[PDB]
Design a protein around this ligand. Sequence first.
Ligand SMILES: COc1cc2c[n+](Cc3cc(OC)c(OC)c(OC)c3)ccc2cc1OS(N)(=O)=O
Ligand SMILES: [Zn+2]
Length: 257
Amino acid sequence: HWGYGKHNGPEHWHKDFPIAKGERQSPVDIDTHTAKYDPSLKPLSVSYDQATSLRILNNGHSFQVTFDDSQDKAVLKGGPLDGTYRLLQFHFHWGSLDGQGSEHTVDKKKYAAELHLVHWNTKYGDVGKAVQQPDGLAVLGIFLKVGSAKPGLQKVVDVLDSIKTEGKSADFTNFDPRGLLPESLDYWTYPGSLTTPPLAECVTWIVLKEPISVSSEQVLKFRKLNFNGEGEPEELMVDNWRPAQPLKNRQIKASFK
Ligand SMILES: COc1cc2c[n+](Cc3cc(OC)c(OC)c(OC)c3)ccc2cc1OS(N)(=O)=O
Ligand SMILES: [Zn+2]
């Protein structure tokens, strides 16, 4: 089954998921000199004041915080989107070294990690239906660089000890995702896919220009999670990122000049 190792990593995924070689795969390198300023793009509207986090889970390839998406509590709208998208979860991708870990790159520059906030289009009623649609999901991507600590991330960092191995989960209530956002909401956008299997091409990507800073002590605690389940040979959860895919017939648009 798929993963990020030598024998089951991204270069192998196409054998189980032929769409891995598709026309709108993610992530991509963002070439800042060929991205196109689009003045018709609206500002992002991020309404997270009513968010209700539920649980944090090690799913064997990442860790994720899940939210209550049974109502329009935490929604994303505006930008390139039509309609309302509800926040479902966030998770991270990170590296074994501070020079790698992000999935998207900017002028070939890799960041230490990348935060994905996954939202689904309420027009489709449930996330399972949305993944079958070209505009089903919107993923907000935020880069992490190593520097000063990010205080709003520390509650996540402090609980990772309790979900060290695959399948462990814990109650994780009253977490405010607004503490993870950069100051500016300037963004690039392009049509893309999930970066994990089944790699469905259902995502409007929104990648923020401004990275957030995290401390070396914060990101080191990511690197001590395990891919394996408890009682299996230990395997540190690092480099759980898919490399950049061909842009093919797509245009990256920028909201900022
Ligand atoms: C942890 O990484 C991810 C978890 C995801 C989890 N989901 C949830 C999901 C995905 C589904 O199908 C793919 C579902 O229908 C089978 C479904 O029914 C409830 C729920 C969707 C997209 C995801 C994308 C993810 O990665 S990414 N990098 O493309 O944002
Ligand atoms: Zn992701």
